[PDB]
Design a protein around this nucleic acid. Structure first.
Length: 410
RNA sequence: CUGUAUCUUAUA
């Protein structure tokens, strides 16, 4: 008929009535409760809204599980809208419930049941303190389900909120690593080019690669930048990769002999498409005068193993000539690099890999290559036969013996 | 006589 404008009744003191709980540990307000910390069967989401107790159920285990279980899936339901409004009315209570050990799961349930309009409010809330939210053990999950579920421009706004932050500290963090990995394995590369610019620095790249957590995010970025198929047709990723692989190839020696950055070095040796050039460089720069020394290291011997696995003949041949005739025999013991790596706790593996590639390559098309692999393998056989009495007693020596009976020199 | 990681993937 006529206009009717309906202000909301205030409940200032009535919001404080939910502060009283049966338990010290439990946070469910006493009106909803068995007395055993479970929600009553008489409680309705409508009651939660009526009592203004969304935060208080989201802080409980059983109250939050109730919310997740009965939150409606369709975006046009009235209870869905009233609960979402109550969630996002206050930014501070939203970001507290994101940071809550139990409320995060409800924020994720909202993310699961979201449309584009709701995603806008959620993205603006997360953006205001994204860096600290993703540093938190609880919210980091919410941030990752955001990067999963959002529209790509909303997720890109979130990703770009990290543009000028302490990204070494976030990359090596036990929680933010998974966030950064999730971004680089999820969003298109334009959403996170600022990361690749960040690791154009040598020091940032070293401190992230020399970590159990940051080495895996560096692998995820490199594996994302390498996997294309639009060769020649433009080259944005190529330029990005290059600027990253520059440092890898410039600190290779250090990174390759590191507890964690070795995995990065072997990841670029294993991927033989866009990283092949870099694989070859890495071999040429840190490996190809240092094979004995690196095969005796507990970390670098794995890198030498995957280098023998994945190198091209041209380099495999220089590696083989290094081990067979590249070092001057010890002045006391009169033994070469091959003698040393046969009776080494780590080198043995390198020698086993040498055997493996010289048997796979014996079946190569180029006869010359087949002959060269055969005579390398023959040189290994002669040295193993002259040391077989001592090597037979070792597990590794037994693996070596049964590798060389399972060939055909032809 | 065999070799990296308490996340070779982490919240109720």
């Amino acid at each position: 008929a006529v206009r009717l404008i309906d202000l909301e009744n205030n409940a200032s003191f009535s919001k404080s009535l939910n502060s009283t709980t049966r338990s010290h540990k439990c946070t469910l307000p006493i009106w909803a409760g068995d007395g055993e910390g479970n929600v009553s069967d008489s409680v309705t989401l409508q009651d939660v809204l009526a009592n203004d107790a969304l935060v208080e159920f989201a802080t409980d285990k059983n109250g939050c599980r109730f919310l997740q279980e009965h939150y409606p899936t369709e975006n046009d339901n009235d209870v869905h809208q009233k609960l979402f409004r109550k969630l996002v009315e206050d930014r501070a209570i939203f970001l507290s419930l994101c940071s809550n050990m139990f409320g995060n799961f409800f924020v994720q349930r909202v993310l699961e049941c979201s449309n584009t309009e709701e995603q806008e409010i959620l993205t603006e809330h997360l953006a205001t303190d994204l860096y600290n939210l993703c540093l938190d053990k609880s919210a980091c999950r919410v941030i990752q389900l955001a990067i999963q579920k959002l529209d790509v421009h909303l997720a890109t706004r979130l990703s770009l909120e990290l543009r000028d932050t302490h990204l070494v500290r976030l990359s090596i963090d036990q929680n933010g690593n998974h966030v950064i990995q999730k971004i680089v394995k999820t969003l298109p590369v334009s959403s996170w080019t600022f990361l690749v610019d960040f690791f154009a620095d040598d020091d940032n790249l070293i401190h992230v690669c020399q970590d159990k957590y940051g080495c895996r995010v560096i692998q995820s970025t490199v594996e994302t930048l390498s996997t294309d198929q639009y060769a020649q047709c433009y080259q944005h990723r190529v330029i990005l990769l290059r600027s990253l692989m520059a440092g890898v190839t410039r600190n290779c020696t250090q990174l390759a002999s590191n507890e964690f950055a070795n995995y990065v070095v072997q990841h670029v040796i294993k991927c033989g498409d866009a990283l092949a050039v870099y694989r070859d460089i890495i071999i040429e720069q840190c490996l190809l005068q240092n094979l004995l020394s690196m095969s005796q290291e507990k970390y670098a011997s794995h890198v030498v193993e995957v280098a023998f696995e994945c190198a091209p003949y041209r380099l495999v041949a220089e590696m083989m000539n290094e081990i067979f005739e590249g070092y001057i025999p010890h002045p006391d013991t009169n033994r070469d690099a091959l003698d040393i790596l046969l009776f080494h706790q780590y080198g043995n593996y390198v020698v086993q890999q040498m055997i493996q590639t010289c048997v796979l390559g014996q079946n190569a098309r180029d006869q010359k290559q087949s002959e060269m692999y055969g005579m390398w393998l023959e040189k290994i056989h002669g040295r193993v036969m002259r040391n077989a009495h001592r090597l037979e007693r070792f597990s590794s020596g037994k693996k070596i013996i049964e590798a060389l009976q399972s060939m055909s020199l032809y």
